[PDB]
Amino acid sequence: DIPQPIRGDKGATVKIPRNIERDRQNPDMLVPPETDHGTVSNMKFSFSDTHNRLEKGGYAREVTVRELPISENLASVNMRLKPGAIRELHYHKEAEWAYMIYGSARVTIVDEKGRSFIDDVGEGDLWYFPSGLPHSIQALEEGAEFLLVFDDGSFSENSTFQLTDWLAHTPKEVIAANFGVTKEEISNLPGKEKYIFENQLPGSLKDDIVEGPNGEVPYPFTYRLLEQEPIESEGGKVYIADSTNFKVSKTIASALVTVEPGAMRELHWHPNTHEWQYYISGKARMTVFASDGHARTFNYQAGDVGYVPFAMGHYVENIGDEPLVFLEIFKDDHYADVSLNQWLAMLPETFVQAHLDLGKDFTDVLSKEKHPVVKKK
Amino acid sequence: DIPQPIRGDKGATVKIPRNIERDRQNPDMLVPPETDHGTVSNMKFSFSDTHNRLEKGGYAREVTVRELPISENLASVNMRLKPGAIRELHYHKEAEWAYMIYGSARVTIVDEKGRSFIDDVGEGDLWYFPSGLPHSIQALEEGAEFLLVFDDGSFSENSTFQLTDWLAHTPKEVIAANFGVTKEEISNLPGKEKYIFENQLPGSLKDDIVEGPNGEVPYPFTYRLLEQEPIESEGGKVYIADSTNFKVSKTIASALVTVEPGAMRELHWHPNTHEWQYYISGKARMTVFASDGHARTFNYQAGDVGYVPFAMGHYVENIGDEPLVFLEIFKDDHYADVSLNQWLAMLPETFVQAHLDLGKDFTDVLSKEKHPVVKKK
Amino acid sequence: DIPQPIRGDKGATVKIPRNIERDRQNPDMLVPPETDHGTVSNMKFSFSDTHNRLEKGGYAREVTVRELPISENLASVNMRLKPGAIRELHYHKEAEWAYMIYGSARVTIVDEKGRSFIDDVGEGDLWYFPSGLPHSIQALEEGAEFLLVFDDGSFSENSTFQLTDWLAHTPKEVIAANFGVTKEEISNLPGKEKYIFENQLPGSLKDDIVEGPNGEVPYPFTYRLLEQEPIESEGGKVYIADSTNFKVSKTIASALVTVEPGAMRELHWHPNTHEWQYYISGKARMTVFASDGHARTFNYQAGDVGYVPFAMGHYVENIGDEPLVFLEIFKDDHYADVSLNQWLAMLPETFVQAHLDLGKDFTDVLSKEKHPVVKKK
Amino acid sequence: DIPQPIRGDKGATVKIPRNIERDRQNPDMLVPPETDHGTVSNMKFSFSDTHNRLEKGGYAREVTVRELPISENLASVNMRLKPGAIRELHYHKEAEWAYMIYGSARVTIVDEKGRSFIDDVGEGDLWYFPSGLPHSIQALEEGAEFLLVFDDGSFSENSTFQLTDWLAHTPKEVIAANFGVTKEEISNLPGKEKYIFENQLPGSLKDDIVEGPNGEVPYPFTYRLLEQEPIESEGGKVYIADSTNFKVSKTIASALVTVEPGAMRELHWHPNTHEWQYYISGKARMTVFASDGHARTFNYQAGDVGYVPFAMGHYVENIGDEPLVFLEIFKDDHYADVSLNQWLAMLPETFVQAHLDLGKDFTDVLSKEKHPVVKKK
Amino acid sequence: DIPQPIRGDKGATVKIPRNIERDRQNPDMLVPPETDHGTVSNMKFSFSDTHNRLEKGGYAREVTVRELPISENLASVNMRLKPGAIRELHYHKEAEWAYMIYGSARVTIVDEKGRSFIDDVGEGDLWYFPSGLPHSIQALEEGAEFLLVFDDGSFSENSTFQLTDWLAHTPKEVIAANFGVTKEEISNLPGKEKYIFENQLPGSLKDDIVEGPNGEVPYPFTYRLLEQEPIESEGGKVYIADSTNFKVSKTIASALVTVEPGAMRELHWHPNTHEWQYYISGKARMTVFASDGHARTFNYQAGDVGYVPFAMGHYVENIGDEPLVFLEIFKDDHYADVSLNQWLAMLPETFVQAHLDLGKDFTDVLSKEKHPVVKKK
Ligand SMILES: [Cl-]
Ligand SMILES: [Cl-]
Ligand SMILES: [Cl-]
Ligand SMILES: [Cl-]
Ligand SMILES: [Cl-]
Ligand SMILES: [Cl-]
Ligand SMILES: [Cl-]
Ligand SMILES: [Cl-]
Ligand SMILES: [Cl-]
Ligand SMILES: [Cl-]
Ligand SMILES: [Mn+2]
Ligand SMILES: [Mn+2]
Ligand SMILES: [Mn+2]
Ligand SMILES: [Mn+2]
Ligand SMILES: [Mn+2]
Ligand SMILES: [Mn+2]
Ligand SMILES: [Mn+2]
Ligand SMILES: [Mn+2]
Ligand SMILES: [Mn+2]
Ligand SMILES: [Mn+2]
Ligand code: NA
Ligand code: NA
Ligand code: NA
Ligand code: NA
Ligand code: NA
């Protein structure tokens, strides 16, 4: 039950003190496929290996370019809110995309024309807040836990502007002049940020809707991803949300992938941009093919972030007994992939045979229809 | 009448030789608000602190990233022309935006389809010359003084291509072949650039219009900013020109702001890009809130450049007895701001109260209409 | 037995699928000290989270700037050799430092004057190979497992030049001319690299010494670290090797630290350069103080790499029941530290009291002698 | 009395609102020499244009690469302390050099061998604290005001580690273990930094000297610059301190220059590194010659920072009625200059004549002795 | 006689218009060795492919990082002077090293203590001018042509400060004050640089020596390379000059290599830094081995610059009927190489046999003495 880095006549037993628990989580890294080769950047990081900021009302932990340097364009926060607790009104330079994993929450956003959008989001729903637009989150009666993705990997403390922090660092006489009140009237303003704070549960959504002289926002900032019809194939399902259906989501394209036991996200690549991954549940392995005979295999499980640099070939195999559920995230205005199977199926069979040194028995199995998740025979 | 860096029981008298004239211009820097905190980049530079290039016909001085390093994307020239004097036919890699502060001038531009645009510009008018399109300026009978803004902060001698400089560094036999003339016919070409040169006043605009086989340009390269209806609020006026109304101005969005004595440009931020400022007249202070409890206050007066990095919160207060007039410049295709007041006004009042630890007496003063310049009570 | 990110009235239970095994390894990251604050880069990475290259004869895995981006100046390989197995003759652009954790090995090196050094290294011994000098490793009868440290964090496949790889990519006619032999005489050269390969155990060291016309090397390339007298203090021992005693080790300074249960490497910083850490055995926590009120705590155990950026304050506490053993590595020609205790002990007591708002009862405990590892009372 | 940017038939009157006070301070920038040409970076910045941090006990303001981007390698703080006030025990990644302009202070420093140095510094004295060594400043009965120079232009809040800040962000149980005390015994530690704080005047220096088991420091960390014999020439004096006489000052070389009215620091350049300048008193102009026909003239007065990039030719002329006093600072282990006069004096006269198209009447005035400050005839 | 890119059954005839003259110069690039592989940067550039600056008195052309981007640290000028012509008094930020290929010249230099050095240099002699020290060159009765090497690859117009250019961009009143003369006395100064200018031949060297009050320079700035005893081996000679024998040459190490027909500079690498090459005469090929199975072969002839990045393996084979003469240049304080032959000769023979899969017949030919240039059998 003690694994060793041995493959046939290659490798040897570990002779120094070691981390057996981590080795058991990484079987394809302690003993990689013999087809791996060459230097490839790290493509895997666990939220469990990050500092958790604890507050009255919840917590937040992040995986950024300071943890996973291959991911320069995207960063992520795992945030948790207790029932009624508020993530303080704030904004960022980055656009923010979110997936609700557990529970439910009410969000607010106001746009640059002064129009307000207030909505409740449940498990499987998304939101997207464009760069610089101010927003808040308040958990409902079950609390909430969700994944935030920001479209800059350097996301840091310097990215986020909190309402009470701004006011605490503005001269009181200027605040008073701004609103037409006296300094005495604003003397009870907080002296520092709140960030996350406890609060009574709100009332019904309909009671919170604020009417305004500038009308309704043209497009909603939330999306019910799991209410859409997925792409179904023999081994699982894919739900896609990008700017073509979730109209406001102009800089983030996303897919939720479910892979049954014994199934795999097929060999494919993305012709548009890098892939950022979050593993919601289950256990996987992925080989990233990096060109020029370079390839490296990684293991993932719940709580891990993954990455596939622009156009590298890859697959995602379920290596456990439970369903594998993960997100594919892209900094682009649409989702796009090329399927290895479909590519070859759409070429003259003798041309494919000339490449692969295989016969009609192989080209006969190719499918001109794309099946993103396939089931083992 | 000698100011000292003392605020209550903090600070002390200056004991070394000092610049009292500059200290008097910078009262909120010698004695900042107690709400300032932390390292913030310099956001202020005076044209009076720059080298002035003097020529027969006028002068030019510039504030670039070599003077104000926070402004990497935008640079500016203050240029002056005597009556009739010509800024030599030239082009740049950068797009050029201009505001006519004093006097009037005739501009020419030819586009990449060979279409010509010639127009007169007066006080309060703009022009915008897209990258690489060749142009000239000639002052009319009052002379002219104007502000140029270029959409690269590294604007330098290497950005600008002058007609006579190009010809002076082209083999004479090639020039002759290009035009179908002899070398003798071009022997009087200048041996070096002119840049700015004296000239007789031109005739009437209508006599200068050149008709061509390629027709008129589809959109004009000048704009009468001060002839537009401004946004009026209790303390001043805002005139906006961006690509939605000044159609050719695709990379520069602008606003001219006037703030009466006792008034202020309200607390706001820009959700799209950095703000570059030029102070035409009057005296101001601005606090820039940089997130994570960082804030710094700056003083400005006529001839100063200011800056607000992308999405930082700010206000601009008139601290003098005369109107304050300044420009807000953005490298983007539209102007956008979020008002702190309007943001909070469009949220449920009890939610705002929970954030600010203030009551209904405060939320009752919030306005759902945006008022960019407010008047002190 | 299921840990939760809860500290008093802060934090909450985890509601999404999670990595409980990693959470148990990182108790001070799931529940940090309340004294932590602010954004700090990741300072921790496990060799168990890396791809292991398996060969006939052993294995090698690496932690580089592609895994741990804060460590730009230093990278490391964990290498294992079976009895008699050879790490092929090679050289690198980087200098190489090594610590023998398990077993023993014979090394060779030849310098730029053609002088050879051949020696056996056992547990607790070091070697240092200057940049560009060619070397080899061959394990003896117990095999060997050791830590290599290279003085560039970007250490990659492109850093290392193998004997047989060079020859395989040199025209055969040039090799033949170089050595004065025929192409037929070199026809059996390998067609690709070996890297690590199995081999019979060598004979006695004395039989391998090669005499040469250029004499002996002036300084040895191996060092018996654990044969030196350590600095002993109440809670452990420190063995230092830098260029002042291990003369050739000009770019790497090192210390082996042992910390008994209930003891800690005291609060200190390094005034010369960054610290790179490898945890040989045991379990630790460290808080890195990053200035300006920023601090973050990390957990470490056997197989982990740590890091402390230049001059940040830190301590290393044993949080387990077994001894804690780790290496402190520095890219410099000497080891240097400043002790917080010794610093304060060497100042006037009333001056220290004025800083700390503590009395003579505190300054009486300060020690003017440096004790690098202290024991809890 | 209103200056205009007019030189003969070049330039014109200013027609827009302007800063006449700054124009009067910058006569050679409003009206440059006709020999100036081309793009040259800004080489001038005033401490009066910076934010002043006010505390109980004094103030501090800084000029860094964020203000003066040409100065990437050096930054400076103007710091003021009231009588008895303390600049809190701290250290930096950067080396620190200082010149005492007004008053006097006591400094402490402890080195990496635990040796203490405590000394009083008066007007005209220097100190130098090597990178990472911890130190403090306490003003004596006159207070103190001084110039600090740090050998990295990016000097920021993140450069400096304060004693009480470190302790406030260290777990109390770790502090207690570090010193062998209880948590109750350290319960009164400050919760945040002090930075600068008021304190009673100290006793006599001799009473503060702390004896230690590690002996005295080998070289002193203070230097009496104005007690040295200066280089005297017809128009002023130069006092040099570099690592050849102020032995510890390995990364900063300095000169204090005094220039009488009607005198000038002669035409020269530095063959080793960039020059950073601080103007203590008086009024100057300097032309920087940047090669390839580029040159720009700058004005300076008390409180200004100047700069001369590596090897650019320059002079510093007194343009006022009082003595001109300034510092020349270099990030190097020695001071070096080449004098234009001495250079030409040491060449064959007919060779110099062939270059300059001048005769023996000119070469007869050249001097083979270097005179750094010359007096007008 | 028309070469084609065909090697056995690989390659094909060229079907498009082509440069047959260049193909004939590059036989090992049109048809590389089959042992070449992979992407390798360009390592070859011809002075004949550069712009030649022509002046009255000579010419100058350069190969810099703008031509050969792999060479970031070193750049070179081929300069020619007619009899008596002068390269104008000047200095640079870079150190300058030179090899006299044709003719002879007189150089001057003055150091930072005002000491002068004047000397004549002939064919095969060197000079080295440290950074920032001012110098001149004047050809004697045969004229001169020489190679300059500067220790920054970005060497450009902005690197060099000319005497008359500096004076032309300094206010006349400042020049007059600097020297104690009137403006009328300097009215005939040149209005622009000379750079290279014609002049009468100088007198005898002894008549030019300028005596000074500061004594003689401690070390000479010229070196007679070809008067030294070379390393001789069967196929050629190597003359080395670095800071250990040419004492002032602290940043440039050099070797002049002569390779007879049928000989080769042996397989070796440099453990210290990059190699920069200039081919004085003859024809060569070199394969650069770049690690990880990458290698590329280049052709060189008179007038070419070559390069070998730090530690890459290489050889230089004479592929013509005349001697091959080239320079090896290094930015370091010493020359160092490792010989492949000597390396293997200094190891146990059975250990080498185990690596190469060759027998005693091969290890018997290895030599423990280094022979830098070997002759084919
Ligand atoms: Cl206030
Ligand atoms: Cl409402
Ligand atoms: Cl011509
Ligand atoms: Cl016409
Ligand atoms: Cl061959
Ligand atoms: Cl032997
Ligand atoms: Cl505690
Ligand atoms: Cl004591
Ligand atoms: Cl003059
Ligand atoms: Cl003489
Ligand atoms: Mn957010
Ligand atoms: Mn994918
Ligand atoms: Mn223009
Ligand atoms: Mn604004
Ligand atoms: Mn090695
Ligand atoms: Mn340490
Ligand atoms: Mn300090
Ligand atoms: Mn100087
Ligand atoms: Mn030169
Ligand atoms: Mn070589
Ligand atoms: Na990073
Ligand atoms: Na800059
Ligand atoms: Na990296
Ligand atoms: Na800067
Ligand atoms: Na280049």
Author numbering:
A (entry chain A), B (entry chain A), C (entry chain A), D (entry chain A), E (entry chain A): 6 to 382
The authors write:
The hexameric low-pH stress response enzyme oxalate decarboxylase catalyzes the decarboxylation of the oxalate mono-anion in the soil bacterium Bacillus subtilis. A single protein subunit contains two Mn-binding cupin domains, and catalysis depends on Mn(III) at the N-terminal site. A π-stacked tryptophan pair (W96/W274) links two neighboring protein subunits together, thus reducing the Mn-to-Mn distance from 25.9 Å (intrasubunit) to 21.5 Å (intersubunit). The present study suggests a mechanistic function for the C-terminal Mn as an electron hole donor for the N-terminal Mn.
Site-directed replacement of tryptophan by phenylalanine was used to inactivate LRET while replacement with tyrosine was used as a potential positive control owing to its similar reduction potential compared with tryptophan. Since tyrosine has a redox potential similar to that of tryptophan it was expected to rescue activity. Of interest, the single W→Y mutants (W96Y and W274Y) have predicted hopping rates approximately the same as in the WT simulations, confirming our premise that replacing tryptophan with tyrosine will have little effect on the overall electron hopping rates, assuming that a proton acceptor is available to establish a neutral tyrosyl radical as the hopping intermediate. As expected, the W→Y single mutations rescue catalytic efficiency to almost WT levels. X-ray crystallography was carried out on single crystals of the W96F and W96Y forms to determine the structure of the W mutant proteins. W96F and W96Y mutants share the wildtype tertiary structure. Significantly, the π-stacking of W274 with the substituted phenylalanine (W96F) and tyrosine (W96Y) aromatic ring system was conserved. The average distance of the aromatic planes within each dimer differed only marginally by ∼ 0.1 Å or less. X-ray crystallography was used to confirm that the quaternary structure was not significantly disturbed by the mutations.
